[PDB]
Amino acid sequence: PIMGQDVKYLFQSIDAATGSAPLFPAYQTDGSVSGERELFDEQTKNGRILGPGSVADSGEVTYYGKRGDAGQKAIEDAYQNGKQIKFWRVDTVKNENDKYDAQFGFAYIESREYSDGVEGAVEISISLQVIGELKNGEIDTLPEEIVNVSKGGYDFQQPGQTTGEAPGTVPA
Amino acid sequence: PIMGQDVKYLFQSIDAATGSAPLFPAYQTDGSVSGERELFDEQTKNGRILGPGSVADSGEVTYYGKRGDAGQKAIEDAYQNGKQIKFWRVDTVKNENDKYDAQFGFAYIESREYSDGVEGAVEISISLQVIGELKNGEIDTLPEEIVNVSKGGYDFQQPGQTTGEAPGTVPA
Amino acid sequence: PIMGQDVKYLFQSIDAATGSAPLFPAYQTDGSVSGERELFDEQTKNGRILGPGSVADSGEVTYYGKRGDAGQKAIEDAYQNGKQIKFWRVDTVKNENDKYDAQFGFAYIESREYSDGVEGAVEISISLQVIGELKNGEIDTLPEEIVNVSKGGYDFQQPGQTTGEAPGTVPA
Amino acid sequence: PIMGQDVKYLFQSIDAATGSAPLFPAYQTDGSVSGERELFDEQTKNGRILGPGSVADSGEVTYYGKRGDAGQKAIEDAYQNGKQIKFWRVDTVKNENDKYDAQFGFAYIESREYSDGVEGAVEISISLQVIGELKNGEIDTLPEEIVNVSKGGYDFQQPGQTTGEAPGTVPA
Amino acid sequence: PIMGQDVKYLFQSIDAATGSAPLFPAYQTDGSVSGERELFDEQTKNGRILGPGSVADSGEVTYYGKRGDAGQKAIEDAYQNGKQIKFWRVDTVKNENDKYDAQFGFAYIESREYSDGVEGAVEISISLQVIGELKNGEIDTLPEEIVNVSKGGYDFQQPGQTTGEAPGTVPA
Amino acid sequence: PIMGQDVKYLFQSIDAATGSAPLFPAYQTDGSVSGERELFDEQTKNGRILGPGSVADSGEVTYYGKRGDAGQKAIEDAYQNGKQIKFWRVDTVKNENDKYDAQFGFAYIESREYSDGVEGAVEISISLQVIGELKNGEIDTLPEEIVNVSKGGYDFQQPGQTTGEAPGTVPA
Amino acid sequence: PIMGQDVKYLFQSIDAATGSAPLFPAYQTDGSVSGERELFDEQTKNGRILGPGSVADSGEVTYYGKRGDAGQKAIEDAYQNGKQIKFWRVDTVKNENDKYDAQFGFAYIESREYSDGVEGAVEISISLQVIGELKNGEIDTLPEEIVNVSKGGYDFQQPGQTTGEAPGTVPA
Amino acid sequence: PIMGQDVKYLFQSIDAATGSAPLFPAYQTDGSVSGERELFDEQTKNGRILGPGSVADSGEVTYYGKRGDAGQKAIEDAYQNGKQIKFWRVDTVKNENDKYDAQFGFAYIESREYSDGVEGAVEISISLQVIGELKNGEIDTLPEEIVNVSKGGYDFQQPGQTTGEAPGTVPA
Amino acid sequence: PIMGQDVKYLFQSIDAATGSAPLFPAYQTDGSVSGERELFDEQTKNGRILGPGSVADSGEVTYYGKRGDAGQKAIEDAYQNGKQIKFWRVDTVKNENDKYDAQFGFAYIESREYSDGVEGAVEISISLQVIGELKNGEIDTLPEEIVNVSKGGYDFQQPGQTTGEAPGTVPA
Amino acid sequence: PIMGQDVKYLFQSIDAATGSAPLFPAYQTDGSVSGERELFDEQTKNGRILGPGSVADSGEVTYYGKRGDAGQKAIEDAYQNGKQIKFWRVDTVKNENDKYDAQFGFAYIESREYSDGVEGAVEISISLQVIGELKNGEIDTLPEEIVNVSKGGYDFQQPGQTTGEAPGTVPA
Amino acid sequence: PIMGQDVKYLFQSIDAATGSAPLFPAYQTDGSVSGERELFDEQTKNGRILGPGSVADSGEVTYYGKRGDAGQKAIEDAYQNGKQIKFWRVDTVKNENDKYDAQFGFAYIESREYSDGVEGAVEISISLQVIGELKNGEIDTLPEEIVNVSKGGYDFQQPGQTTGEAPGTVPA
């Protein structure tokens, strides 16, 4: 069906106007908790609980902060300076009508609470509020996170690897 | 007696008007919590706890989201667009007067909160409110979820399987 | 002393007027939580804590739902239709003045909350409110639940068992 | 020092007027939680927190219900009928001025909440309220619970034991 | 006394209604491990060991798989399709009140774990679960496994054996 | 000193009232594992090792099942039906104050787990649980297991032995 | 650095006027939770959260009650009768200006809640309120709890120890 | 990326005016929980949740107390006397524009709650409030906590170490 | 160096006040397993493993039960009745400062688990718990176990030995 | 097929950038344990085994430490200083498509645990972790370990060997 | 290469300031097990196994206790009194840059568990913890354990040896 790796959250800044959708890697658990309230009276009857309510949809997105890769710096530009976020919930599996699919929203951060442990690495917890989801199922997701994530390790170069962990470079 | 597999929740959309009852497969745990309040005074006596109250009956239905099989798209059509759900709580064991039996209701979703983990696959949690259950024990349940769930694995075809996991197809 | 099996709850419907006391089989844990409040002041003194209060006695009765045996349908006739319950808390050990003994009450259900799991079987939780217990220790409990619970297994019939789990029947 | 077995709770009914102090056998964990409030002020200063408050002292006494031995029936005479309790907190170690010592009070039950499990035996939880502790350290505790608890098992009588668990009887 | 050959496990299907009791030959070791739990308590006393427990009685039955002889096909019909087993622990020695004697049960399989080695022959391990054994000393055990197991081999047929290993047939 | 044959376990049923003490023939190894717990604490000190604990003394009693000799049927009456055991750990050597000496207890069985092998004979493992051992050094042990165990074999009766293995009977 | 043993709480009664500082031994975990509030506004700005607040400093002191050693009787004289406590938080490590050091205060007990378990020994929990800590780092701590805690065990006296656990006495 | 060791909190007093940034060693877990509220109405619409709110950013900084190293005494000068703190959140990894980078703030302590256990060492918990973070990424961090944390153990001096744990001194 | 015979465990009762140190004959393997805990920390550093822990020192003392020689009855007086033991770990070789040397303690028994085998003799396992070993090198060990153990056997007494196995007595 | 000598692990440092691939000689047992997790779920169905898992492949590489040959010094530079390893699993037999073949990775050491025995020589155990193996079948393996391993020893040099064990050098 | 005799563990006290390095003779097996933990993450990727962890390096040092030779008395001064150890892992083979080489540390003892057998001699097991090993290759190891260990035995002195086992002294 749909795995815990099959869904990722493409983020886009309000000020770039560049069609790339930088999602930030090293994810963790997530959440799109869609809380829709509802009217209730009794009418001296069994109840009138059928009535609708306003929908407030939150997001608990957790990840790990890498030392560069300024998409999270755009997240902190949205939070600490004060902006909003173009928010995309896209999938990894291939559809046959579109390429992928999504739940879309213009989101605003409640809180950016990150833990700095001792043995565990740091983890950024981020809350989200959005007005209402919008099912903008689209096609191009700029595939640097779907097929690009292949093995981690690359092939070799015996005289000239000149590399730490993140593999595959020319000598100097 | 009745096992944790012996009870499933047949759903039907308000707009289909089609007698098929699409329940959505790949379930998880459930809940039909029937909270009925009660008038309580003391009357300068031991109490008047005998008095009835209004019944508000909720449902915590959890499952896993499959990439197709649009019954859950009818769930999200009822939630996100805003509709109601024809709700059926049917059993799997065979009765001797009817075929199966049920607790019935016209239900309305509070919240659709799904978790996107990392190692575990995604899980959809859904809350339900219903006015009052109605014991419409009926017969036909369109048996694609009672006897049809048999083994998962199918027989073989050695020169011509041409199949991934979900078995049993012709070569093209 | 008194074991966790030594106490069972004989139930009786308000409309049967039948002297049998059908308790329901396949129990789980229970609880008779007797919450009595108290007149609590200070009176410019150490306190007037000695004063009594109203007694509200609840019960958390859990069991497993069996596919027949309509005593639980009498429970649901008391709950969902709206009635009351004749409630008996009897013991299994043999007294020397009476046969058994009891804590008695006319009870009313708050809530009927059952869980439908996946691997665990379904479990019915039921809350109870009663005005006040009454020590009607009586004799006859119709012993189909005291001595009749003996082994589960019966002897055999090799050419003629014709039986599934619950043993001991004639050939058709 | 003082063990968890070294402290037991001698109880006495208000209506017996008999000097025996029936404590109940087969106890469980306990608690004498002494909550004394205090005048909490500031007085445009660092605080006036030195001021005293009223003392409300509770007791969470748990035990297991034996099928006879009517001391617990005197507890239920204090609770279900409605009375008060003469409450003694005595020790097991031998003093050199007295025999034993105690914290004393006239107590009143909040609640009698007992759990009836399935495999675990039943356990009676009892709450207590007292005006104020009083250090009436006395001598005689009627030693059927200090030195009498020795082994449980007794010696034998091979042609004539005629006994179940609790040993040491004559043949009929 | 009683040897390791003196006890064999006669099996019977729930669906046959045939008085034959097919045990399956080529046995290996067995086990009827009767784990009855208990309430061990401390009670500010020496202890409250009196508490009985539920009896969970398992069976480690190992044997060798023969290419026919459909008793093990009835075992796999009870396991893989999902049924139960009429279980018999009978003895080989001759009693004087009955013919033989037994510990009886209605069993359900935990696991059917068989080892396919290389040079050792294949061996089937089967776990068993029963509510409670029942001392059903009976007489007829269809003696094809008490007296009929005599040598393995037979005497001779010098002109007209015409057989493989297991001797004693007419020529074609 | 004391050999592994010098200590045997005389048993007695709770219902017999017969001074015989049936121990069982063809014993195997034993065990009286006396686990007394303790309070070990630290107290911002070196330790609070002073605390005694409850003593739970188990027994691993193994033997071989003989086809009669109903002392093991008294064991299975204590276990499979549900009773207790009068338990005796007596010695074989002669004392000068008494005849023999013992550690005594009232025991309750955890488990009765016997192995049915193939070539080794069957062996019964029995777990035991007692409140506390009691040093009841007594005299009479009904000497059919101290001096009577001499050889097994006897001399002869050349015309009229007419016996199987266990020798020494009259002709028919 | 500072161990969990390196800090102990020297207590002194208000009525003794004796320079000995009886702390009570057999400690357990502790706590000096210093809750200082703060002026909390916004002032149509980012906030005025810089502003100070009143300090309320509590102490969760847990220990085990020894049968004598009346420093805890001075604690119960402060609580149950109603007094105050001179409170010292001193260290065990040696300083090079002073001997030891302290966080000091005049404290008042909220609550004295002790648990009487079954297998665990009793444990006294005590809450503390103090106006404000005062750093009266002093020298003499009457070293019977710093260097005197050495091993617990003492040397011997083979004809004349005459002692239980707490060692080292003359013969009577 | 960024490890749990890669971020440390450089502290500076308001009164020193010394460019050293004494952070206190022996850290534990941390936290910079940035709680920013938001304007919340509905306007007879889907909602006006887009509106910003005030940011209150807290810090849970835990560490272990060392017997000297008076930076924590400057923390206690800020708390117990009443001052403020210059607060730096710097990274350990090397940047290529600056040396390191930081999140800065002028902070004020809510509470200083430390635990004194028995087996575990003491642990200081400290809460922080700050108006707003300021991204003052600077260069020099006085590298006695970035490179100087190398091994702990030093080389040797066999005739003349004269040292306890923290190694490397001259003889006297 | 030091052989397995060179170290023996002299015991002394708490109630005897007799300078004899009864050790027991026919010892078996031993053990003084000194488990001292420690503080294990990481501290955003290489570690703060420095922390000492409490020392909990056990003893696995195994021997063979001789039918008399009541030192083991003093052990069973310490265990089964409930007392403590004066514990001695002395050596056999001669020193030049003292006669012998020792590691000393005051011990308390966890468990007394002895095996009653069949063909091996019985063996007693005893667990020990001590606060802290103390290096009490002393002189006199009452030499009936250092020099007296030479052969067991003696030379002869041809007319009048009149002895069983352990030789050397007068006629009658 | 493939023997236990036919596979060797070529190692390369991250800092060398020299095309030599130093494996370290005197191998012992190895291991590439490829642990790929999975999602096994139940779904009120037969199961949902479809879920892939992350793959964590470990290496148990054991060898013997030679006194020089600095490849193991590069291992200890990766472990004790802290680096990573370019990891190679190559084969010894000659292929016809390439020269040799391999499973490749970028590895990081868990532990370096070596045993220093007495009568056996020392042995180094090393654990390995890799993100993902990659099938990099390549050609050149610098043949000092494929064809060069011929005997260990050489033929002879009768006058002028002048060598220790490892033969074949010029005089001086 | 390197034999099990080629590596020995030179010890030095923290209080001596004597350049001698007393190792203790009669070694047995050893161990320096270097457990360095790591961050193990999945990150909706192939993994983030990259994270370094803290190194906890232990030592299992076993030897035989000689009756003098106070190096082990310095070990017991570190354990039983409470100190630390200067720890040396040096090699026996000769280098050409230095004489020998080492892995060095400052160690603290977990446990000192020694076995006192019967027919085998005693053996001491000692556990070690160190912050971090440091590669301190040095020259002088006080060669009384590298070259001086030659045979054990010496040549002769035929009239005037006058010695026990370890030979080579003057007459008297």
Residue numbers in the entry:
A (entry chain E), B (entry chain F), C (entry chain A), D (entry chain B), E (entry chain G), F (entry chain H), ...: 5 to 176
Can you provide the manuscript's text about this entry?
In the Siphoviridae SPP1 phage, the tail tube consists of the TTPs gp17.1 and gp17.1* in a ratio of 3:1, with the latter being generated by a translational frameshift adding a fibronectin type III (FN3) domain to the C-terminus of the protein. However, virions only containing gp17.1 are still viable and infectious, indicating that the additional C-terminal FN3 domain is dispensable for phage assembly and infection. gp17.1 monomers are unstable in solution and spontaneously self-polymerize into long tubes in vitro which are indistinguishable from native tubes. Six gp17.1 subunits assemble into a ring with the inner 24 β-strands forming a β-barrel that defines the inner lumen of the tube. The α-helices are arranged almost parallel to the tail tube axis. These rings stack onto each other with a rotation of 21.9° forming a right-handed helical, hollow tube.
For cryo-EM experiments, we purified ΔN−3 gp17.1 which is indistinguishable from wt gp17.1 as judged by solid-state NMR. Curvy tubes were observed in the micrographs. For image processing those tubes that appeared most straight were selected. 3D reconstruction (see “Methods” section) yielded a density map with an average resolution of 4.3 Å. The local resolution varies significantly, from about 3.5 Å at the inner ring where the β-strands are well resolved, to worse than 5 Å at the periphery. The inner β-barrel shows nearly no motion on these timescales—which correlates with these areas being highest resolved in the cryo-EM density. The global, collective nature of this motion does not impose heterogeneity onto the cryo-EM map since only straight tubes are considered for structure calculation. In the context of the tail tube complex the C-arm of the superjacent subunit folds onto the outer β-sheet of the β-sandwich fold by anchoring the sidechain of Gln162 into a pocket. This interaction obscures the lipophilic area whereupon the complex is stabilized, because the number of unfavorable hydrophobic contacts with the solvent is reduced. Overall, our hybrid data support a model where the C-arm (143–176) and the loop (40–59) act as bellows contributing to tail tube bending by stretching.
